[PDB]
């Protein structure tokens, strides 16, 4: 009799995934995302498209999925499929194809305080224009632009992750389990919040 069922059926009962979890008016959902490059697959100079396999880590808080561990035998962490929850529609806008969304809709780790850790992997065909001038001795500045195509800034506040109180203003790359592409070498990998 997994105590996680009692809990999940209590939470998802009286839960609408269409509804932003704003506790009240005036409340902006602080959505914290972080990118992890797994493979650089291609930069088709003809199509002018960069192909990447990334694990993007979305983090946010849903006040509706909070509970008291004492009532559930100490359970502080539950996995709920993302198809059942409200998610911020964080997408790749600078895509050439129409794949705005992620590839694998992984489960969302839900903590007792309402914290949500979603680590969905994605395969993105971005658009980055080429600078042919010095081809083939060229370096390209290819961007991945992430924004919510549903919610605005009065609703969600996109921000970068804060690990150890310092902002993660860069793409994370495992120095041991990262295979360099074969034609393209990564020199810089910054990340900044931009406003139009």
């Amino acid at each position: 009799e997994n105590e996680e069922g009692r809990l999940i059926e209590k939470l998802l009962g009286d839960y609408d995934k269409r509804i932003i979890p704003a506790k009240t008016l005036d409340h902006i959902i602080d959505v914290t995302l972080k990118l992890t490059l797994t493979n650089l697959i291609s930069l088709n100079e003809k199509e002018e498209a960069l192909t990447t396999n990334v694990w993007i880590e979305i983090q946010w808080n849903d006040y509706r999925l909070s509970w008291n561990t004492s009532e559930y035998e100490g359970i502080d962490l539950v996995r709920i499929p993302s198809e059942l929850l409200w998610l911020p529609d964080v997408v790749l806008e600078n895509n050439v194809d129409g794949q705005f969304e992620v590839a694998y809709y992984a489960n969302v780790l839900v903590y007792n305080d309402g914290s949500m850790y979603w680590l969905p992997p994605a395969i993105y065909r971005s658009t980055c224009p080429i600078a042919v001038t010095y081809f083939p001795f060229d370096w390209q500045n290819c961007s991945l632009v992430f924004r919510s195509q549903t919610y605005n800034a009065h609703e969600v506040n996109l921000q970068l992750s804060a690990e150890e109180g310092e902002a993660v203003e860069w793409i994370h790359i495992d120095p041991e389990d990262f295979t360099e592409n074969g034609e393209w070498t990564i020199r810089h990998r910054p990340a900044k919040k931009n406003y139009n």
Partner: protein, 73 residues
């Protein structure tokens, strides 16, 4: 010697065979650098393995120098 080793599940305090009496501890954070923290490798060694720019090694000569950072020797 009595070293802590990650070559078991769960972690164990096992004594090293003859030839290795240096308890080492490698650490480095991979793609899960945030949700989990740095990796933790522990065990036995005859000589302190090499170090790379991203690693964080600590080898000793005593018993149980290399506990998980969330424990004590």
């Amino acid at each position: 010697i009595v070293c802590h080793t990650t070559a078991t599940s769960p972690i164990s305090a096992v004594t090293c065979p003859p030839g290795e009496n240096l308890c080492y501890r490698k650490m480095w954070c991979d793609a899960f650098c945030s949700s989990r923290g740095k990796v933790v490798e522990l065990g036995c060694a005859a000589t302190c393995p090499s170090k790379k720019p991203y690693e964080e090694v600590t080898c000793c000569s005593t018993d149980k120098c290399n506990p998980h950072p969330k424990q004590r020797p």
